[PDB]
């Protein structure tokens, strides 16, 4: 049973990334090595982020929920945007290709580092927990979030982006960076159940995706 | 997961005969007795619902394990359920079972698990196959795992007996009366074998007698012309191993002259803490004119005159050498030809109360114990000082005022004995029980000594096993059908995701049209 | 690699700690609520290999490779055949790791002799001058440090703190390492047959001639660079070793230099044969 549950969790986490990779046409462009390079960039950025946090921020000893600490972590999450920009600048191609390569490589690298080991050790345990399935869904939400963030970074980095659109892009980037902190604060404040928290994260990511898509379409059409 | 303590049914070999459970490791799903198939399952039974037939049914079905849930208050449990369990308990111990049997004290989480398992077991019969599949898929299974390793034999367990002596006025040559009580408890679970009545009451009586005689022997005016030996024997429930070794050491060795020729009689105290009936068990009826007969006459006279409520009678059982286990401690002395008898409230040694985990401090009545102690003390004193020949009437109690038995000191001794289990496999040489018993005896008695018996390596009379106490962890689990349904759901989700990505162009065009319309308006 | 990834657990008094810096970092991050504090402890652990030490080793490794790449290209033409242009590279580390190896072997022999003399002949003035050894079990696996004599001056200071406490010792050690490396490099070129004359002979045997220069002229041109390259390279190698030791790089500054240069020379041999 434990192997079957682990296989189901692994399939749910992994297959959406493969489907996105095949359907987006990245396989046609032989982008796999570019995605691997993006993942290496993610590993480098995450190491720099951990080093920055340890060097500059002492751990708060207050028992109460560390609102300052979570806000600081979200502020450090800007490094992920910088890394995504570096990956897109390093990668040549159409804007959609750059966005998809950066998002897919970053999300896959995060999935491998953060969820595979917990899936491997925990999901093979005797005890059944919904948390592994929730984490597998959360990886798909992270993948969508990274796609949105990469699209936003590409739009802001566009030389031709009109000044009217620029504040909207900056606001969307701000919301994307602070989304994790806001969601954790909201879940703590409302004592939300794990399923409700996952649903709320999905809804927020979907709304961000829809707004980013609408802005992207408007920006492309304004130049078409 | 929920972790709770489980007490395993004891494993031991006596005279080469295997007893109890051989397995200590469990890794099976929990089920109730109601389940049709118990094979390779952990069967949960409550003591209130426990029946010997259902336990046999689980063994017949090769249950993976049996866990018996005990109510937290033994006194609270109805006395009929306890009586039935006590009667079944010797048969259960006598029967060797491969299936591990554990005892768990009730906990709210354990009860909730038991109820959930019972509901899951019942639901399977009541519903159509589609409903059963849906209920099974949504149901939570529990997996019971023991943290302990497989049990192993203890090759060098030592049973320790404590002896103390009071010398009479005239020295060692004077006739010696030996008062013996075994301190060890026995029951289905050693950790639950408090043995308050069996034989905590007897130990309490022995200690009170030791105090009273020590006080009498302190003063020359009250100093008797008898030697008194108080012996607290280990392994009484295991064929009186400690008594046998102590007899061998005293009688085989010429230096220990006290027992060879000077033993007036041996009084063994077993289960004297309860009941209004008192039975004197004798291997051979005392001959007229012998000191043992004098003691019997004094005991009957004191019971009839001072304590008419107490029904005293003599029970004669011939010793059967064929039987592996001696019925009474006095039989061991009788084999060595020492005159000995056992005083007990039990009509028969086979009573379940004598060897049950249900023998707890609440069962023992302090008033009954005090009365029996007074009767024994008066009878012994009357024999020792030959009061009846001196013309002292039977109705008059010697033990009044300064020599009155102390019911608070008896209650304290009973509480101390019952605070911890005194099973022979749990009583270590360095244990607090032995050290306290030796110190207490040493206060009132002279020449307190500890005798240690070890089973022979070539032919061990008794073998004990470890893993009597373990932690059992109940893990929540889902059945394989649930995983199959989840896999189907995941496949459908992946198909929907693939179609959504394939049709994303339609969404993109729709958004482009909506944005154009918004610009136009 | 072992210090980086070792799964062995060492029982530090507070707790069982993984020896491997990376494994310890992951275990501490997983098991500790204070992830930032656990990371800081992994970076600045006093008793076990640190992540900072690993980063220092990586930085040294990159720096050493960068210096290794420095070369002076001398244009050589085949005299017999027109148009064949080769460069004869005079590397900055012309004498290779051999000056380090010779210095370390000499120091090692000195330590062995000193420890024997101290063990067998306690209290003799010559023995004390050569070295006095004391076993310092300061909350760590026992290490015998030379507390007096020449061996003390030859020993590397364990930290910047020790350098601050004993500045004279650090200066003497640095001067000794640089001077010995330069001296060994110069002597090695003469002993090795790698002098400008010998290289010119090898080029003549290979029928390679510098453009516009006779074979005799080649010796003079090579003799301008090779002695300077040898001595400066030995000094640079000593300075890099001292810097890596002060930075606390895992595997030692000497070890890292030796590994990098040996790997580079093996790679060059592999490419040449291939």
Swiss-Prot record, chain C:
Q: Please state where this protein is localized.
A: Endoplasmic reticulum membrane
Task: Cite the source lineage.
Answer: Eukaryota, Metazoa, Chordata, Craniata, Vertebrata
Keyword hit for Ribosomal protein: no
Q: Does the keyword Heme apply?
A: no
Tell me which domain of life the UniProt entry assigns to the organism this sequence originates from.
Eukaryota
Identify this protein by name. Protein transport protein Sec61 subunit alpha isoform 1
The residues exposed to the Lumenal compartment are 6-50, 116-165, 247-252
UniProt topological domain (Cytoplasmic) ranges:
69-94, 189-229
Which family is annotated? Answer: Belongs to the SecY/SEC61-alpha family.
Q: Which GO terms describe its molecular function?
A: protein transmembrane transporter activity; ribosome binding; signal sequence binding
Keywords from the UniProt entry:
Developmental protein, Endoplasmic reticulum, Membrane, Protein transport, Translocation, Transmembrane, Transmembrane helix, Transport
């Amino acid at each position: 049973m434990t192997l079957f549950h682990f296989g189901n969790c692994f399939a749910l986490a992994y297959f959406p990334y493969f489907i996105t990779y095949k359907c987006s046409g990245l396989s046609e462009y032989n982008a796999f090595w570019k995605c691997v390079q993006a993942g290496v960039t993610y590993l480098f950025v995450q190491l720099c982020k951990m080093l920055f946090l340890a060097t500059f921020f002492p751990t708060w000893e207050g028992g109460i929920y560390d609102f300052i600490g979570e806000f600081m972590k979200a502020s450090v999450d800007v490094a992920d945007l910088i890394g995504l920009n570096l990956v897109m600048s390093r990668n040549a191609g159409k804007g959609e290709y750059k966005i998809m390569v950066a998002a897919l490589g970053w999300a896959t690298a995060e999935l491998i580092m953060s969820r595979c080991i917990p899936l491997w050790v925990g999901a093979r345990g005797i005890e059944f927990d919904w948390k592994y399935i929730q984490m597998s869904i959360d990886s798909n939400i992270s993948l969508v979030h990274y796609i949105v963030a990469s699209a936003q970074v590409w739009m802001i980095t566009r030389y031709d982006l009109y000044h009217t659109f620029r504040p909207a892009v900056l606001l969307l980037m701000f919301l994307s960076v602070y989304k994790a902190f806001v969601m954790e604060t909201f879940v703590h404040l409302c004592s939300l159940g794990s399923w409700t928290a996952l649903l709320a994260r999905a809804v927020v990511t979907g709304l961000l995706a829809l707004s980013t898509l609408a802005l992207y379409v408007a920006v492309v059409n304004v130049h078409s | 997961a929920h972790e709770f303590t489980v007490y395993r049914m004891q494993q031991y070999d006596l005279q080469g005969q295997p007893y109890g459970t051989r397995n200590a490791v469990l890794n099976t799903e929990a089920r109730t007795i109601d389940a049709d198939v118990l094979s390779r399952r952990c069967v949960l039974m409550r003591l209130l619902d426990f029946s010997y037939e259902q336990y046999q049914k689980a063994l017949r079905q090769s249950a993976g394990a049996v866990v018996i849930i005990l109510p937290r208050a033994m006194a609270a449990v109805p006395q009929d359920v306890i009586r039935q369990f006590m009667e079944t308990e010797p048969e259960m111990l006598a029967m060797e079972t491969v299936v591990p049997v554990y005892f768990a004290v009730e906990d709210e989480a354990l009860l909730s698990i038991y109820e959930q398992t019972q509901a899951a077991s019942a639901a399977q019969g009541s519903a159509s196959a589609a409903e059963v599949l849906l209920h099974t898929a949504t149901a939570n299974g529990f997996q019971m795992v023991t943290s302990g390793v497989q049990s192993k034999a203890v090759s060098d367990w030592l049973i320790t007996s404590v002896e103390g002596r009071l010398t009479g006025l005239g020295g060692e040559d004077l006739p010696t009366i030996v008062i013996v009580a075994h301190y060890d408890a026995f029951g289905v679970a050693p950790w639950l074998s408090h043995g308050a009545d069996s034989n905590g009451s007897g130990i309490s009586v022995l200690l009170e007698l030791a105090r009273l005689f020590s006080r009498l022997y302190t003063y020359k005016r009250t100093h008797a012309a008898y030697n008194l030996l108080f012996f607290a024997s280990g392994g009484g429930k295991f064929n009186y191993q400690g008594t046998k070794r102590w007899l061998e050491d005293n009688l085989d060795h010429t230096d220990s002259s006290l027992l060879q020729d000077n033993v007036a009689f041996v009084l063994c105290l077993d289960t004297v803490g309860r009941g209004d009936s008192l039975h004197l068990h004798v291997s051979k009826p005392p001959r007229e004119g012998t000191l043992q007969h004098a003691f019997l006459r004094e005991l009957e006279a004191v019971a009839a005159h001072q304590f008419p409520e107490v029904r005293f009678s003599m029970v004669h059982k011939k010793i059967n050498l064929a039987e592996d286990i001696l019925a009474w401690e006095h039989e061991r002395f009788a084999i060595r030809r020492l005159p000995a008898f056992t005083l007990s409230h039990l009509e028969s040694h086979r009573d379940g109360q004598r060897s049950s985990i249900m023998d707890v401090r609440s069962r023992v009545d302090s008033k009954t114990l005090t009365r029996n102690t007074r009767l024994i003390a008066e009878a012994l004193t009357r024999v020792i000082y030959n009061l009846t020949e001196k013309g002292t009437p039977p109705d008059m109690p010697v033990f009044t005022e300064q020599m009155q038995i102390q019911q608070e000191q008896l209650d304290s001794v009973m509480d101390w004995l019952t605070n911890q289990p005194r099973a022979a496999q749990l009583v270590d040489k360095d244990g607090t029980l032995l050290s306290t018993l030796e110190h207490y005896l040493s206060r009132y008695l002279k020449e307190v000594k500890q005798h240690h018996i070890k089973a022979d390596k070539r032919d061990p009379e008794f073998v004990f096993y470890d893993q009597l106490k373990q932690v059992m962890n109940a893990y929540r689990v889902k059945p394989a059908i649930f995983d199959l349904l989840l896999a189907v759901c995941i496949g459908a989700y992946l198909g929907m995701a693939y179609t959504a990505v394939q049709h994303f162009d339609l969404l993109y065009k729709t958004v482009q049209r909506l944005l154009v319309k918004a610009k136009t308006q | 690699v072992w210090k980086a990834f070792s799964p062995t657990t060492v029982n530090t008094g507070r707790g069982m700690e993984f020896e491997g810096a990376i494994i310890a970092l992951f275990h501490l991050l997983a098991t500790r609520t204070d992830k930032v504090r656990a990371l800081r402890e992994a970076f600045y652990r006093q008793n076990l290999p640190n992540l900072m030490n690993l980063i220092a080793t990586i930085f040294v490794f990159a720096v050493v490779i960068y210096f290794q790449g420095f070369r002076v290209d001398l244009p050589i033409k085949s005299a017999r055949y027109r148009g064949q242009y080769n460069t004869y590279p005079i590397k900055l580390f012309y004498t290779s790791n051999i000056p380090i190896i010779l210095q370390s072997a000499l120091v090692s022999n000195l330590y062995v002799i000193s420890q024997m003399l101290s063990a067998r002949f306690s209290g003799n003035l010559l023995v004390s001058l050569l070295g006095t050894w004391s076993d310092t079990s300061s909350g760590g696996p026992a290490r015998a440090y030379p507390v007096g004599g020449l061996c003390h001056y030859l020993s590397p200071p364990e930290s910047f703190g020790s350098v601050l406490e004993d500045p004279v010792h650090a200066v003497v050690y640095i001067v000794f390492m640089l001077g010995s490396c330069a001296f060994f490099s110069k002597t090695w070129i003469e002993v090795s047959g790698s002098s400008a004359k010998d290289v010119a002979k090898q080029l003549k045997e290979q029928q390679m001639v510098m453009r516009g220069h006779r074979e005799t002229s080649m010796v003079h041109e090579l003799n301008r660079y090779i002695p300077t390259a040898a001595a400066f390279g030995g000094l640079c190698i000593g300075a890099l070793s001292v810097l890596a030791d002060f930075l606390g790089a895992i595997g030692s500054g000497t070890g890292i230099l030796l590994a990098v240069t040996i790997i580079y020379q093996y790679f060059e041999i592999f490419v040449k044969e291939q």
